[PDB]
Amino acid sequence: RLLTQCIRGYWEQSHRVAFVNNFHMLMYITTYLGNGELPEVCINIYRDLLQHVRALRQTITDFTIQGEGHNGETSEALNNILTDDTFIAPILWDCDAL
Amino acid sequence: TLDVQMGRFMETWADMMPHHPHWVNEHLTILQFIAPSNPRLRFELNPAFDFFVAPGDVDLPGPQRPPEAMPTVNATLRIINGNIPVPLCPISFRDCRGTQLGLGRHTMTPATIKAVKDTFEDRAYPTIFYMLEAVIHGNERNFCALLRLLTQCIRGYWEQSHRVAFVNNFHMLMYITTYLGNGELPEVCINIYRDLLQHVRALRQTITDFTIQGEGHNGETSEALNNILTDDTFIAPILWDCDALIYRDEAARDRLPAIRVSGRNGYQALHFVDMAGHNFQRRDNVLIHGRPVRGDTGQAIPITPHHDREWGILSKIYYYIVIPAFSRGSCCTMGVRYDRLYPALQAVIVPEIPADEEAPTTPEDPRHPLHAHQLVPNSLNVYFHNAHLTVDGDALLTLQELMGDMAERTTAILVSSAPDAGAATATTRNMRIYDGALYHGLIMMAYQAYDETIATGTFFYPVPVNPLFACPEHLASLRGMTNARRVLAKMVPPIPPFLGANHHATIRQPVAYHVTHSKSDFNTLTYSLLGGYFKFTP
Amino acid sequence: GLIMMAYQAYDETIATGTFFYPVPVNPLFACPEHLASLRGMTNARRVLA
Amino acid sequence: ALQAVIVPEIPADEEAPTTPEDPRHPLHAHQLVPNSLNVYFHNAHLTVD
Amino acid sequence: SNPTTFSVEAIAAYTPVALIRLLNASGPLQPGHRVDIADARSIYTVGAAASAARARANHNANTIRRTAMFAETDPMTWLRPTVGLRRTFNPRII
Amino acid sequence: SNPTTFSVEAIAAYTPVALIRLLNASGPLQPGHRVDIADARSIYTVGAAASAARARANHNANTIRRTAMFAETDPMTWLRPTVGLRRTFNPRII
Numbered sequence: 001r002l003l004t005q006c007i008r009g010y011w012e013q014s015h016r017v018a019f020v021n022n023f024h025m026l027m028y029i030t031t032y033l034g035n036g037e038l039p040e041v042c043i044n045i046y047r048d049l050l051q052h053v054r055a056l057r058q059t060i061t062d063f064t065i066q067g068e069g070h071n072g073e074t075s076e077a078l079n080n081i082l083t084d085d086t087f088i089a090p091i092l093w094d095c096d097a098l
Numbered sequence: 099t100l101d102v103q104m105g106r107f108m109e110t111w112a113d114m115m116p117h118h119p120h121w122v123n124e125h126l127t128i129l130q131f132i133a134p135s136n137p138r139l140r141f142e143l144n145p146a147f148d149f150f151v152a153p154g155d156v157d158l159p160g161p162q163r164p165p166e167a168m169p170t171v172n173a174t175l176r177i178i179n180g181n182i183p184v185p186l187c188p189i190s191f192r193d194c195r196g197t198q199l200g201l202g203r204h205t206m207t208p209a210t211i212k213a214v215k216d217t218f219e220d221r222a223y224p225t226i227f228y229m230l231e232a233v234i235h236g237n238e239r240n241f242c243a244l245l246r247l248l249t250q251c252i253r254g255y256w257e258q259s260h261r262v263a264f265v266n267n268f269h270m271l272m273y274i275t276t277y278l279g280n281g282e283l284p285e286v287c288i289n290i291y292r293d294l295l296q297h298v299r300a301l302r303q304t305i306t307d308f309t310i311q312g313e314g315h316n317g318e319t320s321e322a323l324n325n326i327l328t329d330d331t332f333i334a335p336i337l338w339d340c341d342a343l344i345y346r347d348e349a350a351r352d353r354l355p356a357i358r359v360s361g362r363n364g365y366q367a368l369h370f371v372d373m374a375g376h377n378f379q380r381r382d383n384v385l386i387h388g389r390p391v392r393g394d395t396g397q398a399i400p401i402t403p404h405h406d407r408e409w410g411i412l413s414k415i416y417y418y419i420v421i422p423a424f425s426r427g428s429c430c431t432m433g434v435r436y437d438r439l440y441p442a443l444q445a446v447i448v449p450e451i452p453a454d455e456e457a458p459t460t461p462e463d464p465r466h467p468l469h470a471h472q473l474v475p476n477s478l479n480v481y482f483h484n485a486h487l488t489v490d491g492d493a494l495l496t497l498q499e500l501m502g503d504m505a506e507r508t509t510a511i512l513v514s515s516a517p518d519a520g521a522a523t524a525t526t527r528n529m530r531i532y533d534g535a536l537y538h539g540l541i542m543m544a545y546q547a548y549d550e551t552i553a554t555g556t557f558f559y560p561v562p563v564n565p566l567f568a569c570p571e572h573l574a575s576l577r578g579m580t581n582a583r584r585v586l587a588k589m590v591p592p593i594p595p596f597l598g599a600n601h602h603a604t605i606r607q608p609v610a611y612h613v614t615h616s617k618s619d620f621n622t623l624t625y626s627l628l629g630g631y632f633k634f635t636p
Numbered sequence: 637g638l639i640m641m642a643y644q645a646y647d648e649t650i651a652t653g654t655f656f657y658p659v660p661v662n663p664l665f666a667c668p669e670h671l672a673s674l675r676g677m678t679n680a681r682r683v684l685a
Numbered sequence: 686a687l688q689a690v691i692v693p694e695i696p697a698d699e700e701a702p703t704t705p706e707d708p709r710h711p712l713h714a715h716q717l718v719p720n721s722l723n724v725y726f727h728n729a730h731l732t733v734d
Numbered sequence: 735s736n737p738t739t740f741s742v743e744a745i746a747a748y749t750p751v752a753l754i755r756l757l758n759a760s761g762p763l764q765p766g767h768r769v770d771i772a773d774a775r776s777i778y779t780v781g782a783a784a785s786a787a788r789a790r791a792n793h794n795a796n797t798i799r800r801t802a803m804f805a806e807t808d809p810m811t812w813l814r815p816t817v818g819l820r821r822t823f824n825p826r827i828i
Numbered sequence: 829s830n831p832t833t834f835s836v837e838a839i840a841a842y843t844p845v846a847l848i849r850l851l852n853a854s855g856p857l858q859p860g861h862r863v864d865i866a867d868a869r870s871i872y873t874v875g876a877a878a879s880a881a882r883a884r885a886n887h888n889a890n891t892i893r894r895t896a897m898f899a900e901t902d903p904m905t906w907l908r909p910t911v912g913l914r915r916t917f918n919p920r921i922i
Contacts, residue, residue, distance in 0.1 A: 280728070280729045280730045280731075281729075281730040281731075282730055
């Protein structure tokens with residue numbers, strides 16, 4: 001309730017998007033606050049940002065050749081870095097990356 | 099019960115694969131396909147045939163575990179001319195051909211394109227629509243009983259996100275267009291539905307235009323002899339009624355048919371199942387036809403098909419053109435868990451209104467079913483309030499009038515036939531075609547892996563049969579999926595062998611590669627996909 | 637006589653061919669899908685029409 | 686099939702109903718009997734007096 | 735209703751079950767005891783459905799009874815063509 | 829609460845801290861006395877949180893109790909699926 005009211009207050013006062021900061025914020029906003037609790041324009045912005053992230057991931061997938069993995073490492077991680085599990089995010093909230 | 103079978107398939111498939119398949123490598127360009135290091139190049143000889151390696155002395159279909167055999171080379175017929183591999187017939191050529199077909203034909207206005215793309219793209223799509231589509235299951239006397247609740251739910255979903263609901267099934271769009279089209283729904287929604295239906299009929303007219311009638315051989319019409327979307331032998335990926343199987347059985351009659359519905363050959367078609375004899379754990383080959391409305395059910399009365407033959411043509415056109423051209427290989431065909439679903443559908447908490455009183459409308463007063471007082475844990479109103487929709491008491495109470503007709507469980511149907519009289523040669527009759535479908539199954543639009551309010555695999559489990567409807571990410575909903583299973587399923591589309599394989603199916607891998615790796619438009623893609631589905635029979 | 641704009645065969649709230657029956661006279665006003673409202677319609681006559 | 690109207694006997698010194706939410710209207714569910722013209726007009730969602 | 739006596743869940747349990755708005759399933763159980771079980775499952779379901787159709791009971795003084803759905807006999811049809819109601823109105827009758 | 833006697837800050841101070849909406853801190857101090865100090869800080873914090881959880885006291889006549897949140901057992905799950913409330917409603921019971 002507090003998150004919904006705060007984002008609605010920040011949006012219909014300056015037409016700017018709140019909480020675009022953390023990655024573990026727009027997953028949660030898109031999954032939970034996407035069924036109609038927010039105005040139509042905000043959830044479209046969050047869904048479009050998520051669309052662009054997944055489009056970049058799909059672009060990484062197209063430019064590699066699968067099926068050639070060496071020593072327990074997939075080919076997509078062996079081609080790119082953003083799919084390489086050794087390289088970690090600049091900030092961490094939960095220990096799953098380690 | 100289609101869960102043990104899928105689990106056995108994955109547990110066998112974990113170590114079944116020692117190398118990458120030769121029919122997946124369709125990302126090659128022309129100069130790499132022509133290059134002498136290509137191992138597939140020796141097996142590409144005749145443009146209307148696919149040559150592969152097959153087990154010897156094996157009578158298809160065989161047992162669950164393939165017997166050891168000496169490998170021999172078996173051929174099969176390329177029914178589609180778009181089944182010619184993508185390095186030989188390029189994507190850009192198919193797009194230009196589709197532009198040539200759709201020159202003066204009907205196109206969709208960009209509003210419908212944007213709304214339907216936003217619906218197929220919606221990862222926060224409410225599952226209430228999925229359960230209602232699974233439970234209504236495309237029956238006229240069952241859909242029209244819930245007209246008010248469907249109207250309220252569609253109006254609630256549209257005037258909060260500007261997205262068009264229930265565009266999943268084909269016995270949902272046609273019913274909405276026929277019944278809820280006189281003005282109950284707002285002006286913009288029915289325009290989008292009517293534009294989709296008009297585009298489907300324009301594709302049908304395009305199929306009719308590019309053929310020459312008056313040439314029917316062995317009781318097979320010219321349309322089915324030229325095209326596939328007008329072929330009665332080929333069936334829709336999801337069957338809701340047994341009418342398509344009836345038309346398949348009486349239409350072919352000379353090309354040798356066969357059907358396998360959960361074990362033994364043949365179907366039974368016993369309709370009108372109720373609370374008396376539902377029997378969720380049923381094992382035999384019976385299929386629930388649903389209640390006919392123009393007559394009496396009876397027991398000795400044979401099954402009469404619900405709709406005209408044109409409904410099947412529109413169904414195949416929709417499911418094989420419009421859904422792939424918009425979804426682009428993200429949607430996955432699945433069966434539901436009815437025995438896990440109906441006990442969750444009996445829990446409504448509609449209160450007892452006093453007499454000589456008016457029904458509440460807004461959810462602010464206590465008498466509303468969606469108010470905070472009535473939101474008990476594990477009910478149906480928590481399911482509705484998760485989707486943030488507003489419904490009335492009678493709209494929730496019409497499920498009792500629904501409940502007299504039900505569906506038992508989903509099942510896997512594998513039909514097969516000889517090639518038609520157009521290409522029936524004494525050596526071509528042995529090369530049979532095997533394709534599959536789900537009775538009483540669904541498709542979700544895109545899969546949400548992080549919605550933890552509903553536990554994964556509670557209602558729907560992934561069982562894909564089409565290369566167009568393969569799903570690399572939906573397999574997390576299956577019980578017992580590891581990282582290795584995901585990484586082996588990422589490169590190969592998982593199609594189980596009890597639903598037909600790629601080299602024996604009708605719709606093959608190059609059509610899926612064309613639909614998932616083309617970025618042209620949404621009208622030109624549809625006309626290119628129609629121009630693909632033209633037979634290469636002489 | 638009347639002219640209808642487009643025939644619907646999937647609206648079951650009115651029985652088929654209750655008030656109108658197809659009797660077309662023009663090549664312009666021919667109707668392949670309106671013949672489902674005549675009593676005694678089969679597959680052969682439909683595909684021949 | 687046209688002789689069956691369910692227009693109610695409106696009392697004198699009372700105003701004619703326009704919206705269909707009141708029981709005095711012909712298209713209210715109280716005055717919506719099967720097999721009449723009221724079901725024909727309500728199937729098309731058109732409001733008349 | 736008695737003596738059977740009351741569903742405590744248990745696997746016995748009793749087949750109707752004529753309650754409504756039950757906060758009894760969840761609720762404690764807590765959990766099920768050392769009984770074999772198979773069914774249970776459908777017995778509860780057909781019990782609950784008939785215990786909600788019986789929990790209608792009233793809301794029929796608000797009806798506006800059931801209608802003919804589509805156009806069908808209606809055993810005369812020689813004076814009066816049948817037309818069914820599409821139930822998109824609000825049945826409240828007041 | 830008594831006899832300890834009352835947090836005058838000081839560093840003793842007294843660990844609950846059973847006051848509400850205190851304008852005690854700012855407020856005069858003015859400032860703290862000649863003591864060692866480090867904690868203080870933790871003892872204040874655990875007391876302040878407890879003196880807000882206790883300062884709820886009422887407003888549970890307005891709940892609308894907390895629920896299962898997410899989908900989890902719910903110790904049967906063999907006759908009914910489990911789905912929790914996503915709290916976006918206004919809990920007031922009135």
